[PDB]
Amino acid sequence: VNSFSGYLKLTDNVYIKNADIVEEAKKVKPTVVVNAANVYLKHGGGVAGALNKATNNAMQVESDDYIATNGPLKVGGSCVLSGHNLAKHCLHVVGPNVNKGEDIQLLKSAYENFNQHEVLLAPLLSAGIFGADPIHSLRVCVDTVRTNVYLAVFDKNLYDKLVSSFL
Ligand SMILES: Cc1c[nH]c2ncnc(NCC3(O)CCOCC3)c12
Ligand SMILES: [Cl-]
Known part of the structure; x- marks a missing residue:
């Protein structure tokens, strides 16, 4: 039993909610929050910009x-740093950025980092400003992550499409 609330259960181990990951992290204080990082850990926008802002720039x-x-990290790689006021740890994971021409096959490698942690709060990797199809990201997540992942989807319209189209 854990303190995540209001999630829809997609599979044995993958759960999903329409939520602001910043607000979710502040409420739950999970052991691990995942950041949608880039290789330089420059947390300028998207999920990373929002998480960093919530730490008053301490993450940066x-x-x-x-x-x-x-x-720099590798595309598909990760590092564990402090979670600051949001979580015990932050797992910074670099999914491929389609708006940089990076290989979408690396998305599976990116999600493999989640398997090193028993429970995580996370965004969909490579979604948003990273330019990948979020339906595809959710599919890769479900088919790659074996540990317990709680996915926060900021956009309500997108959340509904992800649930309704989930196989
Ligand atoms: C930008 C941002 C701020 N707070 C957040 N919490 C969760 N996710 C986020 N962005 C990633 C997506 O959820 C966006 C739409 O499609 C799926 C990927 C954010
Ligand atoms: Cl985003």
Whole structure:
């Protein structure tokens, strides 16, 4: 039993809700919140910009030190950093950005990072400003993640389309 509330159950392990991931994280304080990161951990917009803003830019400060030490992530890769005031940890995961020409096949590799964590609050990877089809992202999520994932979908219209079209 966990404290996630109001989710629709899609499969044995995947749950979904129309919610602002920032507000969900502030309420639940999950062990892991997933960020829709880029390889530079530059949290400018989309989910990343919103999460970072909610930390009063502390996420960005921590991320800049991480990059200065370690260099950029790989597309499809991840790193674990602090969750600040939102969660215990933030798993920064880089899905392919279609608006940069990146290989959509890397979306499966990106979701594989979730399997290193028993329970996660997450957005759909590569959705929104990353330019992928969210219906496809949900399919890859369900077919790749085996741990317990609670998906927050900001757009109500999109949430309804994802549920209604789910096979
Ligand atoms: C931008 C943003 C702020 N707070 C959020 N919480 C959750 N998701 C988000 N964006 C990603 C999508 O949910 C958007 C529409 O289609 C699926 C991907 C955001
Ligand atoms: Cl977005």
